[PDB]
Amino acid sequence: XXRX
Amino acid sequence: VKPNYALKFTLAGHTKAVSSVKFSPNGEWLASSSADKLIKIWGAYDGKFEKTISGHKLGISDVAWSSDSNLLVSASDDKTLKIWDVSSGKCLKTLKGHSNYVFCCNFNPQSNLIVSGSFDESVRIWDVKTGKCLKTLPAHSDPVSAVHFNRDGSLIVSSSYDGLCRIWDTASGQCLKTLIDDDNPPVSFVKFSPNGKYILAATLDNTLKLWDYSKGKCLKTYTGHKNEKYCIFANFSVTGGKWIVSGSEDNLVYIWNLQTKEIVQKLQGHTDVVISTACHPTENIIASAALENDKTIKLWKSDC
């Protein structure tokens, strides 16, 4: 990974 | 008056891209999470790889330390959070309860509880002993980019792509304040300040804003870094000088004068975007991690  | 940061160590061992890096409160270790489903631990001083922590089913988006520097909490794409006894390296409890990915996690100061942001747009609260989910807040109309407590642990700020910053009452579950005030950019990070009275917010308009929430208004704003796509951590630097420290999508680490709002120094040598930064509790060290065209955590020391 989501966040990446 | 201005810090000089020197690259000291570059560390790699991470297969897929890195998501977060946070320093342990004892100023010894650095913990890191990555799309490789793993948590790797590095000597903060020596820069040396210490151990792998794994057993998550999917990519870990975030991780944070407990206060007693006993434990790690990791939020993953697998719908779950894990609580790791960092000494052994083994998972204690696994916390289940989300519709979707778990994006962000932080321990409360007192460290008996955990707050978790999720792509199901809930902020949930978790008892570190039992492991059961205490309360669940339908915080936003949108996925949660961050969650944090305040100095005492009474308050939980959270941010979201919907543009909102909601501050919550830890014991009740009630939303107390909301930070809106024109704009309406997506908000990719928040943490309360150490003195707790101001809360910091990252936005996808390439902005960084500080807020006095009691008064419900922005004070100062910092620019020049590129933040459009990624939700990129934002730090307070309390140690030598008093700074704002953030990653950037132009591959630089940005440091602003907290008062004068313009940039004191930027760090290079990162071959990709910077998703996460962290400051040492005691000495002056920035750690930074970058996305898959880099896969390295760089370590930086200064005299101020």
Quick tags:
heterodimer; B: 304 residues; mainly beta; Methylamine Dehydrogenase, Chain H; four-stranded antiparallel β-sheet; repeat (chain B); histone H3Q5ser reader activity (chain B); WD40/YVTN_repeat-like_dom_sf (chain B)
Describe this structure in words.
Chain B: Belongs to the WD repeat WDR5/wds family. The complex is a heterodimer of chains A (4) and B (304). Helices cover 0% and strands 51% of the residues of chain B. Chain B has 304 residues and is mainly β. Chain B has a single domain (1-304), classed as 7 Propeller (Methylamine Dehydrogenase, Chain H). Chain B is globular and about 45 Å long.
List the helices and strands and how they pair.
The complex is a heterodimer of chains A (4) and B (304).
Chain B: E1 6-11, E2 18-23, E3 29-34, E4 39-43, E5 49-53, E6 60-65, E7 71-76, E8 81-85, E9 90-95, E10 102-107, E11 113-118, E12 123-127, E13 133-137, E14 144-149, E15 155-160, E16 165-169, E17 175-179, E18 187-192, E19 198-203, E20 207-212, E21 217-223, E22 234-237, E23 243-246, E24 253-257, E25 263-267, E26 274-279, E27 285-290, E28 297-301
Antiparallel strand pairs in B: 1-28, 2-3, 3-4, 4-5, 6-7, 7-8, 8-9, 10-11, 11-12, 12-13, 14-15, 15-16, 16-17, 18-19, 19-20, 20-21, 22-23, 23-24, 24-25, 26-27, 27-28
PDB class: transcription/transcription inhibitor
Keywords: MLL1, histone methyltransferase, WD40, TRANSCRIPTION-TRANSCRIPTION INHIBITOR complex
Assembly: dimeric
